[PDB]
């Protein structure tokens, strides 16, 4: 897959929301 979803994710839990990949990058959400 062309996204680093778990380093998205450790990087959203800073700001306490959660990391998702969309397509070819990675947004995070509070859900």
């Known amino acids: 897959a062309f996204?680093?979803?778990?380093?998205?994710?450790?990087?959203?839990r800073s700001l306490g929301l959660l990391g998702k990949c969309i397509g070819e990058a990675c947004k995070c959400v509070p859900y």
């Not at 680093?4 to 990087?11: A, F, K, V």
């Open 3 to 12: 996204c680093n979803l778990r380093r998205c994710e450790l990087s959203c």
